[PDB]
Ligand binder design. Structure first.
Ligand code: NA
Lengths: 111, 111
């Protein structure tokens, strides 16, 4: 139905803030919930954001999700970058038949 | 919700058949659809099985999914193993709030 195009891999110093973006290619980004997963090297994906901006229990408030209707994108912002945040991040949403669509992933390196 | 516990990583020769399993920790495996994703080295997850046993277009019939209610498990079988099948494989399902639950992943190494 569409693809989710994520922003380029980024490097950032500890304590800083980084924002990763996820652009839906057709149809409104606001038409289906966006989730964000963190996948640390060698590990499995875990939710950091679901329903656009909800944090699961145990995910700290340094993580926040947003939706920008004008750019048809979703964004994940991580402030207070810790070296434990070094991971590949994936945005994910659903098409009309409720099939999962994954973004292509963004690598975050903590300098 | 529940956890999905995957079978151990496996190495197998080309042309052989491999089965990876995924056991749901509580509740009924059959109560929510199970999806399997292939994650090739350095790439994003792509669906190989959805809705327990459905292949997306372009996924070869070497891949098949099944559910075993008596062991509360799902299985992904890959016949005629190919070098291109070398990947981490993740099972995935949903809880009654529709929250996504991922398995911890199983690495398939093709010898
Ligand atoms: Na948020």
């Amino acid at each position: 139905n569409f693809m989710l195009t994520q922003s380029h891999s980024v490097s950032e110093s500890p304590g800083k803030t980084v924002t990763i973006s996820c652009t839906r290619s057709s149809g409104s980004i606001a038409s289906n919930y966006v989730q964000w997963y963190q996948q640390r090297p060698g590990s499995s994906p875990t939710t950091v954001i679901y329903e656009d901006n909800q944090r699961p229990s145990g995910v700290p408030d340094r993580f926040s999700g947003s939706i920008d209707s004008s750019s048809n994108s979703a964004s994940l912002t991580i402030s207070g970058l810790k070296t434990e945040d070094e991971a590949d991040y994936y945005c994910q949403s659903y098409d009309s038949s409720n099939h999962v669509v994954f973004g292509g992933g963004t690598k975050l390196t903590v300098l």
